[PDB]
Amino acid sequence: ASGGVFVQSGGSLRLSCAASGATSTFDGMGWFRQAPGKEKEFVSAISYEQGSYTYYADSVKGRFTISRDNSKNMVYLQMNSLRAEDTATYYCAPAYEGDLYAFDEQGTQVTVSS
Amino acid sequence: GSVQIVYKPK
């Protein structure tokens, strides 16, 4: 019954996602989110290839930073300056040319309190 | 058989 992370407004959180590496199908990894009663929203995506793509939703630009560590097969999302409107469940997904592809889901629930 | 796509920014 509805457990997650709790962060005060202005605070920070780091998410991580396992990132197995590029396939014929996928060339990166990213996050989307879904807030209560709202549709899924793109958050960020990054290419496995250094320098290829780094996309952000306009609502998170400047506050969230995505990065990759290919030696650890991981991607990370540093979420700074959190605000109440960032309250959502966050989901990792593989990317192809920046678009995110989900099959099957789980997720990390995040509540940001003003 | 099925997929959910979440598109990158326009």
Residue numbers in the entry:
A (entry chain A): 8 to 111, 115 to 124
B (entry chain B): 304 to 313
Please give the exact wording used by the authors of the publication that reports this structure.
We described previously a VHH with high therapeutic potential in a family of neurodegenerative diseases called tauopathies. The activity of this promising parent VHH named Z70 relies on its binding within the central region of the tau protein.
G115 in Z70 is in a flexible loop (from F110 to G117) that is partially not resolved in the structure (from D111 to G115), whereas E115 electron density in mutant 20 was well defined. Conversely, three residues of this loop (S112-Y113-G114) remained unresolved in the absence of an electron density. Reversely, positioning of the side chains of residues E115 and K47 in close proximity in mutant 20 suggested the formation of a salt bridge that could tether part of the CDR3 long loop to the core of the VHH. Compared to Z70, mutant 20 showed an improved spectrum, even when free in solution, indicating that the presence of the salt bridge influenced the conformational exchange between different structural states. Together with the additional electron density observed for the CDR3 of mutant 20, this data showed that even in the absence of global structural changes, the mutations of VHH Z70 can modulate its conformational entropy, affecting ligand binding.
